[PDB]
């Protein structure tokens, strides 16, 4: 099937482009229902949770904002008190009350019932011995006026001293008064947020587990000091939320204690539904960020997010990436976020990463790389690839098939040379399975077929050259000239059906770039899987060329449908292609049976 401009247009129409946008900020976690409901259960249950999702989602910002709206009962006073001259314990009294116990004690069970042991060991023997006893006053760590918002402690740098506190040494000697608190102490009564990656990098996971499982919170000591203070464990009063990518957790998840300690998974989706409601939420969010946003600017950014997702019906959920693009656009718009400033910011990003493609197109233009984008040839096709370096530019890859009389072999030269990956190899085997099983009249196939990419790659992976390879092969067998103005992309199964491929937009745009650089003929285009219709979010220039009749997109479901377009004839209605393929096989069989 041909895809008209009308079927290919995916962009949002813009009315009153320059009108200033005016919209309230959406709630935290908008379109992230799963993750919010998980966090809500963790908050209600007092459970530890982990926030998981790809980078640049704004996971941290969404979390802090959400936690800012909670209300806990006011955090107790938290303090170290000595139970001895070499022992200390962590204590909580009700809020405000430690300042009285400090004034009382500065008077070198009075009304502090819960602070019993510290007084009950504060006794007497200065008199009985005359022994000079000044390291007996309590050390307040924290205190707070209200539990709204609760304590919220984000420590991105999860070293032992930042988590557990420190011992300073004055000249050696130390005492209760010299114990500095850590993030764990500051988060009591509220929330501690750490990054999974930091716990691994800093090697502090095992100690963190000990803090949560056993209440062991050990202020960091130095290798020098002649002695140290013993620190009693204490009941940990906090909720911990870990943040990281799905891969960051996997190191931690191989430890059964992680599953045990962190029961609630709060997972962010990498895409949201593409809806009026999420476009509107994006608008409100951007305005709250400080952007001066026009309607057309909002619309362009919304469509760029759809395109980032390579889905017409979904939008990229990475708000931090949308923001960063918006920041560039704002500079290009003189402070104003407009349709033009967005398009131009997208175009400047491609320009900044274009050197490699400029080098490539120049080599093609000079004939150092040999490409044909017009005319016809037997056993040759332009397949499409992406280079495995960011930003993953698409390019045509010329591919040839040669047939000889022989004993049923389909060879990939690139695979035999050791250049192809496992899935690439699977694609070749699959084509072999299709041809053997399709053409059985002579017994086993009377041909050997060798496939080669015309340029040499360090490696090729993926299955999406399968369609190009199968059409090349059929063409070589049938002696069928194929159009070189149409590139071909598609994986194939053993039954000759065409399956969806990755990076479809890059692939299509890369052939168009090559056609444009060599001069558009008016008949060029791409054949691609019908299964990829939902992924097509082509750039303006390609859509305009297709609307102009200068470029053409064809969607197929079977390998034969591709071959028909390429060879300019039907399989049947015979004089069709199928009888020419059969005629080729009979010729090869006769040569092979001397």
């Amino acid at each position: 099937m041909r895809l008209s401009y009308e079927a290919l247009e995916w962009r949002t129409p813009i009315e009153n482009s320059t009108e200033p946008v005016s919209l309230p900020p959406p709630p935290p976690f908008f379109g992230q229902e799963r993750a919010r409901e998980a966090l809500e259960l963790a908050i209600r249950g007092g459970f530890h949770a982990y926030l998981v999702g790809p980078p640049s989602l704004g996971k941290h910002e969404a979390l802090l904002a959400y936690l800012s709206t909670q209300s806990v009962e006011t955090p107790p006073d938290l303090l170290y008190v000595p139970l001895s001259e070499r022992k200390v314990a962590v204590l909580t009294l009700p809020s405000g009350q430690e300042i009285h116990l400090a004034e009382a004690v500065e008077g070198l069970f009075q009304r502090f019932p819960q602070a019993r042991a510290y007084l009950e060991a504060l006794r007497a023997r200065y008199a009985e011995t005359g022994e000079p006893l000044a390291q007996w006053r309590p050390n307040l760590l924290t205190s707070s006026s209200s539990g709204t918002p609760p304590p919220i402690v984000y420590e991105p740098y999860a070293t032992a001293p930042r988590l557990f506190g420190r011992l300073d040494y004055l000249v050696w000697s130390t005492n209760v008064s010299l114990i500095r608190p850590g993030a764990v102490h500051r988060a009591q009564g509220g929330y501690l947020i750490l990054d999974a990656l930091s716990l691994k990098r800093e090697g502090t996971w095992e100690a963190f587990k000990r803090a949560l499982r056993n209440g062991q919170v050990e202020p960091v000591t130095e290798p020098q000091a002649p002695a140290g203070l013993e620190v009693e464990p204490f009941p940990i009063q906090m909720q911990v939320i870990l943040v990281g990518t799905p891969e960051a957790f996997e190191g931690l998840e191989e430890d059964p204690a992680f599953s045990e300690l962190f029961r609630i998974r709060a997972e962010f989706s990498p895409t949201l539904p593409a809806s009026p409601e999420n476009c509107t939420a994006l608008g409100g969010w951007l305005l709250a960020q400080g952007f001066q946003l026009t309607q057309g600017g909002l619309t362009r950014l919304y469509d760029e997010a759809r395109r980032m997702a390579e889905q017409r019906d979904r939008m990229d959920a990475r708000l931090v990436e949308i923001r960063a693009l918006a920041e560039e656009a704002a500079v290009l718009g003189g402070g104003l976020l407009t349709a033009e400033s967005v398009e131009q910011a997208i175009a400047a990003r491609e320009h900044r990463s274009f050197l490699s493609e400029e080098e490539f197109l120049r080599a093609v233009q000079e004939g150092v790389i040999r490409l044909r984008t017009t005319g016809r040839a037997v056993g040759e096709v332009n397949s499409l690839v992406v280079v495995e370096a960011a930003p993953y530019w698409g390019r045509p890859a010329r591919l040839t098939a040669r047939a000889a009389p022989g004993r049923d072999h389909l060879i990939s030269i690139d695979r035999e040379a050791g250049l192809g990956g496992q899935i690439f190899h699977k694609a070749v085997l699959t084509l072999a399975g299709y041809l053997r099983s399709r053409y059985i009249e002579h017994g086993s196939l009377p041909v050997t077929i060798s496939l080669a990419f015309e340029q040499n790659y360090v490696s090729i992976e993926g299955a999406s050259a399968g369609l190009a390879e199968l059409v090349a092969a059929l063409s070589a067998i049938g002696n069928l000239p194929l159009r070189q103005d149409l590139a071909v992309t598609g994986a194939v199964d053993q039954t000759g059906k065409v399956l969806a491929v990755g990076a479809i937009n890059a692939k299509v745009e890369g052939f168009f770039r090559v056609c444009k650089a060599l001069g558009l003929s008016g008949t060029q285009g791409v054949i691609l899987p019908e299964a990829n219709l939902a992924n097509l979010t082509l750039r303006a220039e390609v859509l305009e060329a297709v609307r102009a009749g200068q470029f053409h997109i064809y969607a197929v479901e079977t390998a034969e449908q591709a071959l028909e377009i390429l060879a300019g004839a039907r399989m049947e209605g015979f004089r069709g292609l199928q009888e020419k393929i059969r005629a080729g096989l009979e010729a090869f069989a006769r040569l092979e049976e001397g």
Binding site: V387, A397, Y457, I460, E461
Partner: peptide
């Protein structure tokens, strides 16, 4: 170049 089909 390393590539992906």
């Amino acid at each position: 170049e390393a590539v992906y089909a």
